[PDB]
Design a protein around this motif. Structure first.
Motif, PDB file in Angstrom:
ATOM      1  N   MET A   3       0.831  -1.204   0.000  1.00 57.15           N
ATOM      2  CA  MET A   3       0.000   0.000   0.000  1.00 57.15           C
ATOM      3  C   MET A   3       0.865   1.255   0.000  1.00 57.15           C
ATOM      4  O   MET A   3       1.939   1.301   0.625  1.00 57.15           O
ATOM      5  CB  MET A   3      -0.995   0.030   1.170  1.00 57.15           C
ATOM      6  CG  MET A   3      -0.419   0.327   2.541  1.00 57.15           C
ATOM      7  SD  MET A   3      -1.750   0.200   3.771  1.00 57.15           S
ATOM      8  CE  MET A   3      -1.366  -1.350   4.578  1.00 57.15           C
ATOM      9  N   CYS A   4       0.357   2.296  -0.652  1.00 59.27           N
ATOM     10  CA  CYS A   4       0.969   3.611  -0.560  1.00 59.27           C
ATOM     11  C   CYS A   4       0.661   4.182   0.850  1.00 59.27           C
ATOM     12  O   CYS A   4       1.541   4.756   1.521  1.00 59.27           O
ATOM     13  CB  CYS A   4       0.420   4.511  -1.678  1.00 59.27           C
ATOM     14  SG  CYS A   4       1.296   6.052  -1.936  1.00 59.27           S
ATOM     15  N   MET A   5      -0.590   3.966   1.290  1.00 59.36           N
ATOM     16  CA  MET A   5      -1.101   4.407   2.583  1.00 59.36           C
ATOM     17  C   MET A   5      -2.390   3.601   2.815  1.00 59.36           C
ATOM     18  O   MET A   5      -2.914   2.966   1.888  1.00 59.36           O
ATOM     19  CB  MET A   5      -1.412   5.950   2.555  1.00 59.36           C
ATOM     20  CG  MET A   5      -2.585   6.286   1.609  1.00 59.36           C
ATOM     21  SD  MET A   5      -2.975   8.053   1.501  1.00 59.36           S
ATOM     22  CE  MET A   5      -3.392   8.429   3.202  1.00 59.36           C
ATOM     23  N   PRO A   6      -2.921   3.640   4.038  1.00 65.44           N
ATOM     24  CA  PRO A   6      -4.228   3.020   4.285  1.00 65.44           C
ATOM     25  C   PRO A   6      -5.375   3.740   3.633  1.00 65.44           C
ATOM     26  O   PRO A   6      -5.294   4.961   3.409  1.00 65.44           O
ATOM     27  CB  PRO A   6      -4.411   3.142   5.796  1.00 65.44           C
ATOM     28  CG  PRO A   6      -3.113   3.519   6.352  1.00 65.44           C
ATOM     29  CD  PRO A   6      -2.331   4.205   5.260  1.00 65.44           C
ATOM     30  N   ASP A  20      -3.464  11.478  -4.025  1.00 66.72           N
ATOM     31  CA  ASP A  20      -2.310  12.353  -3.633  1.00 66.72           C
ATOM     32  C   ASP A  20      -1.077  11.470  -3.375  1.00 66.72           C
ATOM     33  O   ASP A  20       0.022  11.755  -3.860  1.00 66.72           O
ATOM     34  CB  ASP A  20      -2.692  13.164  -2.372  1.00 66.72           C
ATOM     35  CG  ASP A  20      -1.660  14.239  -1.990  1.00 66.72           C
ATOM     36  OD1 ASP A  20      -0.631  14.394  -2.685  1.00 66.72           O
ATOM     37  OD2 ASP A  20      -1.938  14.955  -1.003  1.00 66.72           O
ATOM     38  N   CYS A  21      -1.268  10.387  -2.618  1.00 62.32           N
ATOM     39  CA  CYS A  21      -0.161   9.464  -2.256  1.00 62.32           C
ATOM     40  C   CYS A  21       0.464   8.923  -3.539  1.00 62.32           C
ATOM     41  O   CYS A  21       1.685   8.796  -3.662  1.00 62.32           O
ATOM     42  CB  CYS A  21      -0.736   8.315  -1.434  1.00 62.32           C
ATOM     43  SG  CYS A  21       0.517   7.345  -0.552  1.00 62.32           S
ATOM     44  N   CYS A  22      -0.390   8.649  -4.531  1.00 57.40           N
ATOM     45  CA  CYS A  22       0.006   7.958  -5.761  1.00 57.40           C
ATOM     46  C   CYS A  22       0.374   8.923  -6.934  1.00 57.40           C
ATOM     47  O   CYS A  22       0.776   8.469  -8.027  1.00 57.40           O
ATOM     48  CB  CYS A  22      -1.074   6.989  -6.239  1.00 57.40           C
ATOM     49  SG  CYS A  22      -1.197   5.569  -5.139  1.00 57.40           S
ATOM     50  N   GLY A  23       0.385  10.216  -6.641  1.00 52.51           N
ATOM     51  CA  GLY A  23       0.930  11.211  -7.558  1.00 52.51           C
ATOM     52  C   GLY A  23      -0.060  12.059  -8.339  1.00 52.51           C
ATOM     53  O   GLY A  23       0.366  12.814  -9.200  1.00 52.51           O
ATOM     54  N   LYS A  29      -6.052   3.699  -6.147  1.00 61.26           N
ATOM     55  CA  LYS A  29      -7.355   3.082  -5.907  1.00 61.26           C
ATOM     56  C   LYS A  29      -7.383   2.571  -4.477  1.00 61.26           C
ATOM     57  O   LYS A  29      -6.422   1.919  -4.008  1.00 61.26           O
ATOM     58  CB  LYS A  29      -7.635   1.918  -6.912  1.00 61.26           C
ATOM     59  CG  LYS A  29      -6.693   0.752  -6.828  1.00 61.26           C
ATOM     60  CD  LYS A  29      -7.104  -0.393  -7.765  1.00 61.26           C
ATOM     61  CE  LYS A  29      -6.103  -1.551  -7.597  1.00 61.26           C
ATOM     62  NZ  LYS A  29      -6.334  -2.730  -8.486  1.00 61.26           N
ATOM     63  N   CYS A  30      -8.481   2.862  -3.781  1.00 58.04           N
ATOM     64  CA  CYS A  30      -8.756   2.212  -2.508  1.00 58.04           C
ATOM     65  C   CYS A  30      -9.360   0.859  -2.738  1.00 58.04           C
ATOM     66  O   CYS A  30     -10.455   0.727  -3.270  1.00 58.04           O
ATOM     67  CB  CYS A  30      -9.711   3.043  -1.645  1.00 58.04           C
ATOM     68  SG  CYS A  30      -8.951   4.516  -0.930  1.00 58.04           S
ATOM     69  N   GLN A  34      -6.328  -0.890   1.748  1.00 59.56           N
ATOM     70  CA  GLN A  34      -5.101  -0.414   1.134  1.00 59.56           C
ATOM     71  C   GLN A  34      -5.374   0.556  -0.002  1.00 59.56           C
ATOM     72  O   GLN A  34      -6.192   0.279  -0.874  1.00 59.56           O
ATOM     73  CB  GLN A  34      -4.256  -1.548   0.575  1.00 59.56           C
ATOM     74  CG  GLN A  34      -3.714  -2.484   1.624  1.00 59.56           C
ATOM     75  CD  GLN A  34      -2.675  -3.443   1.092  1.00 59.56           C
ATOM     76  OE1 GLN A  34      -1.960  -3.124   0.149  1.00 59.56           O
ATOM     77  NE2 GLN A  34      -2.625  -4.656   1.675  1.00 59.56           N
ATOM     78  N   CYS A  35      -4.661   1.685   0.009  1.00 63.18           N
ATOM     79  CA  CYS A  35      -4.496   2.533  -1.182  1.00 63.18           C
ATOM     80  C   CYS A  35      -3.400   1.962  -2.046  1.00 63.18           C
ATOM     81  O   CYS A  35      -2.272   1.788  -1.596  1.00 63.18           O
ATOM     82  CB  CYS A  35      -4.073   3.956  -0.763  1.00 63.18           C
ATOM     83  SG  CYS A  35      -3.605   4.978  -2.172  1.00 63.18           S
ATOM     84  N   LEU A  36      -3.763   1.542  -3.237  1.00 62.96           N
ATOM     85  CA  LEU A  36      -2.814   0.961  -4.168  1.00 62.96           C
ATOM     86  C   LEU A  36      -2.668   1.883  -5.373  1.00 62.96           C
ATOM     87  O   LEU A  36      -3.671   2.296  -5.971  1.00 62.96           O
ATOM     88  CB  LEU A  36      -3.341  -0.402  -4.676  1.00 62.96           C
ATOM     89  CG  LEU A  36      -3.499  -1.514  -3.616  1.00 62.96           C
ATOM     90  CD1 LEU A  36      -4.276  -2.703  -4.112  1.00 62.96           C
ATOM     91  CD2 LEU A  36      -2.120  -1.979  -3.186  1.00 62.96           C
ATOM     92  N   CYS A  37      -1.429   2.137  -5.782  1.00 63.33           N
ATOM     93  CA  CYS A  37      -1.230   2.928  -6.979  1.00 63.33           C
ATOM     94  C   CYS A  37      -1.511   2.049  -8.188  1.00 63.33           C
ATOM     95  O   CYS A  37      -1.061   0.901  -8.257  1.00 63.33           O
ATOM     96  CB  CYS A  37       0.153   3.549  -7.004  1.00 63.33           C
ATOM     97  SG  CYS A  37       0.524   4.559  -5.534  1.00 63.33           S
ATOM     98  N   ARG A  38      -2.299   2.571  -9.114  1.00 66.87           N
ATOM     99  CA  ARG A  38      -2.644   1.877 -10.350  1.00 66.87           C
ATOM    100  C   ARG A  38      -1.456   1.720 -11.263  1.00 66.87           C
ATOM    101  O   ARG A  38      -0.450   2.510 -11.234  1.00 66.87           O
ATOM    102  CB  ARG A  38      -3.761   2.639 -11.080  1.00 66.87           C
ATOM    103  CG  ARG A  38      -5.094   2.597 -10.369  1.00 66.87           C
ATOM    104  CD  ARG A  38      -6.110   3.477 -11.059  1.00 66.87           C
ATOM    105  NE  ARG A  38      -7.495   3.070 -10.751  1.00 66.87           N
ATOM    106  CZ  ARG A  38      -8.513   3.907 -10.692  1.00 66.87           C
ATOM    107  NH1 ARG A  38      -8.315   5.202 -10.884  1.00 66.87           N
ATOM    108  NH2 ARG A  38      -9.761   3.428 -10.625  1.00 66.87           N
TER     109      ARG A  38
END
Length: 38
Positions: A3-6, A20-23, A29-30, A34-38
């Protein structure tokens, strides 16, 4: 980890934060807790 962040359901702005976390817009995507960068 992966995850980038929760992602928390209780944060109504979780999608924006995850982007924001993923740029930027549309980049994160939540998926469950987990926030996952696509």
């Amino acid at each position: 980890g992966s995850m980038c962040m929760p992602c928390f359901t209780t944060d109504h702005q979780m999608a924006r934060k995850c982007d924001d976390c993923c740029g930027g817009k549309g980049r994160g995507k939540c998926y469950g807790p987990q926030c996952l960068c696509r």
